RNA sequence: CUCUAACUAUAAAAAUCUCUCUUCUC
RNA sequence: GAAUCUGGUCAAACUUGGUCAUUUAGAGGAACUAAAAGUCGUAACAAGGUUUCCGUAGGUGAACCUGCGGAAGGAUCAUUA
RNA sequence: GGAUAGUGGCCUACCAUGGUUUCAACGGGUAACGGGGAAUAAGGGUUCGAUUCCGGAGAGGGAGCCUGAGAAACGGCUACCACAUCCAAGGAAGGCAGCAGGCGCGCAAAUUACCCAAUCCUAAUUCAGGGAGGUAGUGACAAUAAAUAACGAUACAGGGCCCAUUCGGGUCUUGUAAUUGGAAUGAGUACAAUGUAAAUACCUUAACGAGGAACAACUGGAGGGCAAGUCUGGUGCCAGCAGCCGCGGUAAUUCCAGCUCCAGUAGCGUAUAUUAAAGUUGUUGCAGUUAAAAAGCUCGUAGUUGAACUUUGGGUCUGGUUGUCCGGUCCGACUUUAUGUCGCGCACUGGUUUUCAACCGGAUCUUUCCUUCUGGCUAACCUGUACUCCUUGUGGGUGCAGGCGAACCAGGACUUUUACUUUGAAAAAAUUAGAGUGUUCAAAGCAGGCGAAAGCUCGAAUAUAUUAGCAUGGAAUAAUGGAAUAGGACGUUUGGUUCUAUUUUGUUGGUUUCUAGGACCAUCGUAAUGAUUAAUAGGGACGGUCGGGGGCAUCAGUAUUCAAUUGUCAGAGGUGAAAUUCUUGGAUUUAUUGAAGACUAACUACUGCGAAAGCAUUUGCCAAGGACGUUUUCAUUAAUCAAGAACGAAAGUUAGGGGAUCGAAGAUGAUCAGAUACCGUCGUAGUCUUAACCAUAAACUAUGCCGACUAGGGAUCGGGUGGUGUUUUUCUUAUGACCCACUCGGCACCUUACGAGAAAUCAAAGUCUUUGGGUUCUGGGGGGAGUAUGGUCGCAAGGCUGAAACUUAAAGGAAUUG
């Protein structure tokens, strides 16, 4: 109930069922979640997106539970892990969107001070994959490169 | 955030035996909140508690019977040497009858009167009288 | 819990914070200042000789109606000008205009002390002997 | 054991004040 | 092998200005205290007789007045009358 | 390279451009020599340390140097500067922060003394020398012990009394009296002798040495704090006292005295400084709603702090330490003795498997490793070779090849790294602590004790220093690191490579071998082949929403003020009451309209959104956001934050635009004693805007943020779940709107104290003397003062930072009665 940018104290969440093997109802075959997740990454889809569809149309309730590797994990063995992970690229998304929207109108400065939270944000997150060594030492966020990343 | 889970775990039992009560729920359940409740349990000041597994830290529930009347965790657990044991229970436990100075020695989570048996001395997390 | 940090590697901020708040204390601040050797009448002296200029009396507050006998005097080991208080019945007398006197402190830490303003000094020795020894004619002065 | 109705509507001017304070122990 | 003497070298110190620091006077100016039996008002404490106070700006013997935003530390915790 | 005794930018030559810093560098101050230590003392600490010991530096300030092993020496020289001395005016000679002593300075500190006796030191060396040093002189700096009377016999008395005829003997004692006696003794003098280098002085001691034992004890105080007077006289708000409160104005328990008493006592009083008191520096251990004090709000580097999880169990054997039950040993009641006896329930020493119970270890079995080998050394018997000393008995052996290495060496080999903690070596003596010891006791000192007096002796103990370093045992707590591209771990794998070199073929030079020794490289297999959860922590995706969040652009509303047309006709404004002002050129009102600018009534609430300011007509566009739902995704990415930044009401400042209302200044008309104030009418700047500044508000919830828990009651907003619910109507249903129940989040509210507060009061201002979840900022009596100065920002206004001198005994908070 942080929101470390904000006064909310929310706890709006899922809870993980206790049962970490899979559900006894659940006649799919891991292999084939494996090829299904393949397929829909290659459509251009980010892990979140992945899991959602599978969630859904399907009866995969959590690629872990089935398979044994996480989404994001079974991408990498692939090969289809993004270069910039996902969070972070839909971060600089919104960034370079609210930047756009104050340099088609200057006197709004409450989106400029939302602009500020959201670059702060950035560079947290930038801070942290860095210490990972997911991204390179030198990689580093700016306002007039973000845009290059994001199209 | 939550800095000093045995702290929470202490602050619940006191509140938890000032109103009166029997039981006590304590969320984050971690090795050391173990090993506090069980010297209580060996020194009587608590009841039969009791690990619920979440796969999620756990949690623990707690059994009292009025026998206890204050934890306490001496948030920065300082150096104690050999000598300082004496100092620590004069400025906090109530007499040189009673109490424990809950402390963490190499040789695992002991209460005081243990360790100076052992003649061995660590940092220091709570008290219990 | 509390204002100050508690971590086991906190005494950097801990100790800073107990030097910059020990300037709040006006004995602490007087000390490291060192304003009694640049500013009081005597650099942490409890004693200081003087010439005596002129011979006043001072009134006193409002609860308090009478003339404190008074003398003003300058200071030989720097030349400053300090009223200071005569302190007994008779002793005005005693002291006479122009002669060495040995003034001492108030005993209320250099401040005024009772009814009488603008003062801060006893009179213990006028030429060379002791007021209290002329008070009761022990001695008397060598009138030189 | 059932229930939301009645009501108004006054502002002129007016400053200042020399003492003195006193003990509770069967 | 003495005086003397060539070039250095360590360099005290001198002259000349420059600079800073501490003392040091100094015409005059603006103050603050204490002393409360001076003078002109009576701002505040009650609805202080214009409710009070804050920020800012102007004005004026003086406290203070006014304008614009606040605040109750307000004199209302209250209109489904 | 030079120089150095020698390393070294120590210096030179040529290169490189580097080194320190928010973990405070650099600079400034120190009325700073560092330390061992001193004062203070529940614990934590605060202050001091010029000086008896160890270091360093200096000889007036500076430089330079000879001699030597050692000096940048100064009771050694050279020069300059400062200060000086004799002078026959040519010259010469100076160094007390050595012992004395003097001038000066200042509140502040000693005699031109004796001597090498003692400690030692120097020298050619016993002998000489030593103001080092010791002895004395002065010395109320501090420190120890301690005189100023003690005891009778008498008169004035008081209590336990034999009872109580009033008595009263005083039967039994304890004081008061200039009565009265006998003792004892020093403080002083002083034969001596001891003492000492010689002398004082002390220890001893002749002879003197106490009656008012004048051989005479003071210093402060007698209202409170604070023990002791409302006794006498004097002065009368004077003189003065009083650390603070206060006394003194004609009856002073406070001033000046006399009397009595109190406190300490050869000491006591003052002044400054400082420590405890001070939980008024708060790490232990302070406070911030209103008493001083939460930055206006948010982001954010450093700093501080940071979720849980990776062997827990068991069984045996076995070693010390306990309390066990008693053995032997025996001692207290039995007294000049004991046992038999009464047992303290054994005063010394064991069985301590008597079960017991621990309190510590050690080894062992877990798929349970503790670094392992490589040779020693095989210490030891799983060795079996020759065999059995002895009862036919594995009790017991002489012993040689395998073969037990933690029983130990000494070598290659790898060592995750810490923080932490136990033990030890180290932390000079003096000091502190502390053992022994009749210096006559004590401060002290390290002495002394015991013989028969005929040389025999126990000492000169210990501990602590909490930091840094070294070694050591432990592995909880806290941190870091492995294997994710396998470039991972192992093996008799099987291949190749630079080599390296013992010996070996004499030795030397190479060529390959062989043997053995590291890897660089493939390939071959062994293996359970290798990735902790997904915090009722966080970020992110998605879903329908929700909102007076924000920007731009449009839309409307009546109102206000003007303007046009029209209508009549003496008044209309305004006020407590009036006046100023507009009006028959027809104002005020009356109808249509038109222009401008502002603003968004009623709906509007103990309701919503936002980081705070703030946000309220409609519609579209732009992006953003909280909350909820989620069997979605990453896996500590987090909390608070010095430095830095973004917004920041109103007012105000530059310009451009507008210009209705209202209105600082101003103009007046009133009220008044005055009124250039409040009431009134006009009225510029401003209010409204586009750019650029400003950064302050009672920027208030006067309550920092994150996190956990603690108590009952309803409602309200946003979301989501369920109802066999109700109206809805589109025949039924789906929505929507309600109703009931629940849940999450938010502004809030009522009751209560069983908690907290000085209370008013708070469901947080609780979980705080039973004091420690993380973290930032601020306050230390009031005033001076948020002033001056110095920075820094600003065009200016002013903002941020921000004292002292001095003055003061209160200022202030909440509540109670008037
Ligand atoms: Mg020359
Ligand atoms: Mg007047
Ligand atoms: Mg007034
Ligand atoms: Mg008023
Ligand atoms: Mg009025
Ligand atoms: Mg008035
Ligand atoms: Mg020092
Ligand atoms: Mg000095
Ligand atoms: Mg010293
Ligand atoms: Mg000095
Ligand atoms: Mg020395
Ligand atoms: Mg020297
Ligand atoms: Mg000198
Ligand atoms: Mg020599
Ligand atoms: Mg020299
Ligand atoms: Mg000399
Ligand atoms: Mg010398
Ligand atoms: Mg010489
Ligand atoms: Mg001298
Ligand atoms: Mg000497
Ligand atoms: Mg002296
Ligand atoms: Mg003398
Ligand atoms: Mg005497
Ligand atoms: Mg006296
Ligand atoms: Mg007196
Ligand atoms: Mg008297
Ligand atoms: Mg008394
Ligand atoms: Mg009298
Ligand atoms: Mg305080
Ligand atoms: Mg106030
Ligand atoms: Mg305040
Ligand atoms: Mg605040
Ligand atoms: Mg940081
Ligand atoms: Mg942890
Ligand atoms: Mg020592
Ligand atoms: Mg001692
Ligand atoms: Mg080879
Ligand atoms: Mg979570
Ligand atoms: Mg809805
Ligand atoms: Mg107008
Ligand atoms: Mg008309
Ligand atoms: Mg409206
Ligand atoms: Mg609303
Ligand atoms: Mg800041
Ligand atoms: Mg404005
Ligand atoms: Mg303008
Ligand atoms: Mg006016
Ligand atoms: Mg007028
Ligand atoms: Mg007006
Ligand atoms: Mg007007
Ligand atoms: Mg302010
Ligand atoms: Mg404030
Ligand atoms: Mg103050
Ligand atoms: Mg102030
Ligand atoms: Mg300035
Ligand atoms: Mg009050």
């Not at chain 1, 990689?139 to 290059?148: D, Q, R």
């Not at chain 3, 302190?87 to 002390?113: I, Q, S, Y």
Request: charged letters at 25%; aromatic letters at 8%; hydrophobic letters at 35%.
């Amino acid at each position: 109930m942080g929101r470390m940018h904000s006064k909310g104290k929310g706890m709006s969440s899922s809870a993980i069922p206790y049962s970490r093997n899979a559900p006894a109802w659940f006649k799919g075959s891991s292999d084939g979640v494996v090829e299904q997740i393949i397929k829909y990454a290659r459509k251009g889809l980010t892990p979140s997106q992945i899991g959602v569809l599978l969630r859904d149309a399907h009866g995969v309730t959590q690629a872990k539970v089935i398979t044994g590797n996480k989404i994001l994990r079974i991408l990498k063995s692939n090969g289809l892990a993004p270069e910039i992970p996902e969070d972070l690229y839909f971060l600089i998304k919104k960034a370079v969107s609210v930047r756009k929207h104050l340099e088609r109108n200057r006197k709004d400065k409450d989106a400029k001070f939302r602009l500020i939270l959201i670059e702060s944000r950035i560079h947290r997150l930038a801070r942290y994959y860095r210490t990972v060594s997911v991204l390179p030492p030198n990689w580093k966020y700016e306002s007039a490169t973000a845009s290059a990343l994001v199209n | 955030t939550r800095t000093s889970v045995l702290a929470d775990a202490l602050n619940a039992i006191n509140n938890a035996e000032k109103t009166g009560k029997r039981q006590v729920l304590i969320r984050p359940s971690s090795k050391v909140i173990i090993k506090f409740l069980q010297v209580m349990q060996k020194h009587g000041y608590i009841g039969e508690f009791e690990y619920i597994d979440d796969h999620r830290s756990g949690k623990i529930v707690v059994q009292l019977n009025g026998r206890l009347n204050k934890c306490g965790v001496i948030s920065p657990r300082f150096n104690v040497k050999i000598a300082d044991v004496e100092k620590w229970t004069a400025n906090l436990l109530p007499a040189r009858q009673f109490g424990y100075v809950i402390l963490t020695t190499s040789a695992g989570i002991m209460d005081h009167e243990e360790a100076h048996r052992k003649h061995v001395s660590g940092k220091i997390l709570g008290f219990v009288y | 819990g509390k204002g100050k940090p508690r971590g086991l590697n906190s005494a950097r901020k801990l100790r800073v914070h107990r030097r910059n708040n020990r300037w709040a204390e006006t004995t602490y601040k007087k000390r490291l200042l060192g304003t009694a050797f640049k500013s009081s009448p005597f650099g942490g002296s409890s004693h200081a000789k003087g010439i005596v200029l002129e011979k006043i009396g001072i009134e006193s507050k409002q609860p308090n109606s009478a003339i404190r006998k008074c003398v003003r005097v300058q200071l030989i080991k720097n030349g400053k000008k300090v009223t200071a208080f005569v302190p007994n019945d008779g002793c005005l007398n005693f002291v006479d205009e122009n002669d060495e006197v040995l003034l001492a402190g108030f005993g209320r830490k250099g401040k005024a002390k009772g009814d009488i303003p603008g003062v801060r000094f006893k009179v213990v020795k006028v030429s060379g002997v002791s007021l209290l020894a002329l008070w009761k004619e022990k001695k008397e002065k060598p009138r030189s």
